[PDB]
Amino acid sequence: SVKSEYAEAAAVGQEAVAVFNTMKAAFQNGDKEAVAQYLARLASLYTRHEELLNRILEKARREGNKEAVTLMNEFTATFQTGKSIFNAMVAAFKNGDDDSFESYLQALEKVTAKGETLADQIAKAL
């Protein structure tokens, strides 16, 4: 249902944010093993998140919920903007580029804040 998919997306989204924050703290402390394993976890969560939203969107469209469909389209563009920065961050880390990695973190952090706000809005709109 819209409700069971939404609740799972919320969990998956919260997990992705928490893992990102844990990964950031690890990096500032020079814990690279930890960092890479979180990158694998984050990418995984992002894929599961996209699949859930694609299903909620279809249900939102079918019930005529133009407000959710609009918000979900803003969240998804925002999410995909952040996901492009994440990809470059993974390519950098594997290349030993710490400086590039730190800059990507800050940028991703700021995109993430935009998605969090839109998340709060989607909750009220579905």
Contact residues for ligand GG2, defined by CB under 6 A: 6, 9-10, 13-14, 16-17, 53, 56, 72, 75, 78-79, 82-83, 108, 111-112, 115-116, 119, 122-123
Shortest gap between Cβ of 106 and ligand GG2 (angstroms)?
A: 13
Minimal distance in Å, beta carbon 46 to ligand GG2?
A: 7
| 26-113-81-51 Cα dihedral, nearest 10 degrees | 90
| 52/85 Cα distance (integer angstroms) | 21
Shortest reach from residue 121's CB to ligand GG2, in Å: 9
Structure tokens belonging to residue 33: 């093993």
- Which DSSP symbol is given to 33? H
126 neighbors 8 (Cβ within 8 angstroms): no
Q: Which CB atom, from 30 or from 85, has the smaller least distance to ligand GG2?
A: 85
Spatial contact of 108 and 89, defined as CB atoms under 8 Å apart = yes
Residue placing its CB nearer to ligand GG2 in the complex, 61 or 96: 61
